Amino acid sequence: VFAHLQVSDSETIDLENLKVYQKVDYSKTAKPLPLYRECLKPNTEITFTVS
RNA sequence: ACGAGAACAUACGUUCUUUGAACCAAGCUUCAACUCC
C-alpha cells in the first residue's frame, strides 16, 4: 500500500516564515530545556503534490 | 661376379573467402533527522 503513494516535496518556502523556539516540557508544570530548534511560525501554508 | 646397375615420389599451390557477441531489461523496492531527559 505504500509502494503506490507518490508524494513530492514542497515549493521553496520563503525564509521569513522561520522562527526559533524554546523547547518546553509540560508534565506537571512547564519548565524549559536548553534546546532551540528553528521551526516555522504558525498558520503557514506548505504545498505538496501527492498522488 | 646377386633379374642386376644408375634413379629424392619430386616440382607448382595463402585453411582461405563472406559474418556487429548481439537483442531485450529504471540501481531500484520499503524507510519521518528522529527519540529521551
Automatic annotation (TrEMBL):
TM spans (from-to): none
Top-level taxonomic group: Bacteria
Function: This subunit might be involved in maturation of a crRNA intermediate to its mature form.
Family: Belongs to the CRISPR-associated Csm5 family.
UniProt protein name: CRISPR system Cms protein Csm5
Species of origin: Lactococcus lactis subsp. lactis
Gene: csm5
